[PDB]
Amino acid sequence: SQLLALASLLGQQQAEVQRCREDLQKKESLVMETIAKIKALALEHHHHHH
Amino acid sequence: SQLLALASLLGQQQAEVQRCREDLQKKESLVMETIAKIKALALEHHHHHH
Amino acid sequence: EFSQLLALASLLGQQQAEVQRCREDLQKKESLVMETIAKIKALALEHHH
Amino acid sequence: EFSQLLALASLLGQQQAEVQRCREDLQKKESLVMETIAKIKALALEHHH
Numbered sequence: 137s138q139l140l141a142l143a144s145l146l147g148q149q150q151a152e153v154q155r156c157r158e159d160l161q162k163k164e165s166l167v168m169e170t171i172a173k174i175k176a177l178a179l180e181h182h183h184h185h186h
Numbered sequence: 187s188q189l190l191a192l193a194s195l196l197g198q199q200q201a202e203v204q205r206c207r208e209d210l211q212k213k214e215s216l217v218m219e220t221i222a223k224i225k226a227l228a229l230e231h232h233h234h235h236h
Numbered sequence: 237e238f239s240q241l242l243a244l245a246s247l248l249g250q251q252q253a254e255v256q257r258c259r260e261d262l263q264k265k266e267s268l269v270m271e272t273i274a275k276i277k278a279l280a281l282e283h284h285h
Numbered sequence: 286e287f288s289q290l291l292a293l294a295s296l297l298g299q300q301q302a303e304v305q306r307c308r309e310d311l312q313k314k315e316s317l318v319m320e321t322i323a324k325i326k327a328l329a330l331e332h333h334h
Contacts (some may be wrong), residue, residue: 238329280287
């Protein structure tokens with residue numbers, strides 16, 4: 137039936153969405169670690185002088 | 187110093203980003219569960235007849 | 237009878253619309269972060285070169 | 286000397302640009318999912334009403 141083809145395609149397309157989402161969340165975590173590094177560095181330059 | 191104010195603002199703004207991201211990921215998981223329910227239902231209607 | 241599937245498809249549209257709304261909120265909040273980052277970078281460039 | 290901070294700020298721009306590129310990819314792949322969902326819903330509406 138056409139339902140079988142669409143359900144198979146939906147499962148494959150949803151699997152591609154999850155693969156893309158997991159790759160995106162990893163790159164988002166990399167951005168967060170970089171931002172936290174900039175914040176800690178700015179706090180170092182502040183408390184070092186003052 | 188101005189570095190202290192910007193670092194404090196950055197930490198607060200980054201905290202708001204993480205709160206929004208965690209809320210978004212929960213709503214994304216709800217979409218995934220609904221899609222998986224539609225796929226399983228379409229497979230039921232297929233194998234029930236055929 | 238596909239009433240349960242149609243009810244889930246109707247709910248999916250509401251859920252997806254909320255996801256896109258939250259994604260717009262995340263973009264605006266991330267832009268504010270990058271605005272503060274640019275202020276920190278401009279301060280760093282002044283006292284370094 | 287803010288060389289380490291400036292180097293991290295330069296890396297952040299590359300990382301953020303990749304995040305936005307991946308978000309565009311996710312939107313296109315999600316739209317394909319919703320296209321198949323609409324085909325399933327149209328099939329369901331035909332055999333239900």
